[PDB]
Write a protein that binds this ligand. Structure first.
Ligand code: FMN
Ligand code: FMN
Lengths: 217, 221
């Protein structure tokens, strides 16, 4: 399993140009299962993963997506990662995550809601800052993003994680096609999936591992 | 199509659960190293790698964190290893960190470097609206560490190692404990999250809950 994992870690690279060859529906389903089963802080699951097969919408997004030109053009599949806005402790979203989990009264539910108020007001210092609340739900999607990429790599499928686009212009294109509801949510990132047209030009580059990892004994 | 690999991934996805109480059994050096390699080798936006992953073995520091960590009480007590995910502050387009991330990749040659800096500038000012907003910039590097969080947890799961991702602590207070011990430079970096690792004492009583998959995943066209 070590050699296999290590092989997947070195196989995953950010590829921009893909083969025409399409990912099977079974491989695609596995990848999305990895997203769906990902853990999210407080089990909120304030996120959605959208397979964008619609070619006109891709064409509309393209001029606003500097980091995604070739991927939007060539990728087998293109996934949008959406995060919930305004997921404040006193929101229905949060209210609904407790019920889902089998929490009820308002003395087991209003109790944990007391903790979530403390968590957002004090612990993470974000309750009264909508951008920070959005950035918090958006962070959970990066967990699913890593899970999808690792699953992909273990299947020999290439990916590219993408932030290189104008967020507000992409959000409005998505809202106008009713792909998202801009009141409730906004895009966090994009992920392309496919088979690389060719081997990467330059080798994998990272900081020396000592500048990144360490032990405090 | 490749059924053996599907089974292995499917086993790991259903194995992973957020584990609060661990047994005493420790993770091997080889398994911890692979897990950390998963974080190190993770992609980050623009190749910045504005992150550090620290194995917190020191028991006194764990003991000090504990009263301010409502979500990590049994994890700090019982976990085999505990990892702090640290993100860089002030990663503005014109910062030394952003410049070094280009140099690392051999980009320097006047307007290869400068031309990228110009893209990173519009990216932070216009695409993400964060160039002049240090909290947003921090949250942006902190987002990258969640990719590593994911890769670490999947690697652990494939290894049979239980895990728990942790945000349930007072960030300012924990930051101050970490700076006080010279674990971080608070002017340059801040904690993003923690991850406990180990072997579950036992399987959970209450099976995994998720939203119906139609409420999370969909296809446009
Ligand atoms: C969240 C994040 C966003 C990214 N956005 C883009 C994108 O905008 N366009 C692109 O071509 N590559 C994008 N990438 C890929 C990075 O440039 C790449 O991960 C980095 O250069 C490290 O190299 P490697 O993953 O190929 O090993 C992104 C990576 C991360 C994780
Ligand atoms: C970023 C993040 C932070 C989390 N923080 C905590 C924590 O502070 N304390 C805790 O007991 N569980 C924590 N969890 C675990 C979640 O409660 C758990 O992932 C969620 O309820 C889904 O259940 P499952 O992972 O067992 O499938 C966290 C999860 C995520 C991804």
């Amino acid at each position: 399993i070590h050699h296999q994992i290590q092989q997947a870690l070195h196989f995953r690279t950010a590829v921009r140009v893909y083969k025409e060859e399409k990912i099977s529906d079974e491989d695609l389903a596995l990848i999305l299962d990895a997203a769906w089963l990902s853990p999210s802080s407080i089990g909120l699951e304030g996120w959605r993963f959208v397979v964008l097969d619609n070619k006109p919408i891709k064409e509309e997004i393209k001029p606003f997506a500097w980091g995604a030109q070739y991927q939007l053009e060539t990728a087998s599949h293109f996934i949008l990662l959406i995060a919930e806005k305004h997921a404040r402790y006193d929101s229905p979203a949060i209210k609904n995550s407790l019920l889902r989990r089998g929490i009820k009264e308002g003395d087991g539910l209003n109790s944990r809601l007391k903790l979530y108020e403390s968590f957002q007001k004090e612990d993470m210092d974000m309750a009264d800052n909508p951008r920070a609340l959005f950035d918090w739900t958006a962070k959970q999607t990066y967990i699913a993003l890593g899970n999808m990429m690792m699953t992909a790599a273990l299947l020999g499928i290439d990916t590219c994680p993408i932030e290189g686009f104008h967020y507000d212009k992409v959000n409005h294109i998505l809202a106008k096609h009713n792909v998202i509801d801009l009141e409730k949510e906004g895009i966090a990132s994009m992920l392309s999936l496919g088979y690389r047209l060719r081997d990467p030009k330059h080798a994998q580059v990272r900081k020396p591992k000592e500048e990144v990892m360490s032990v405090v004994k």
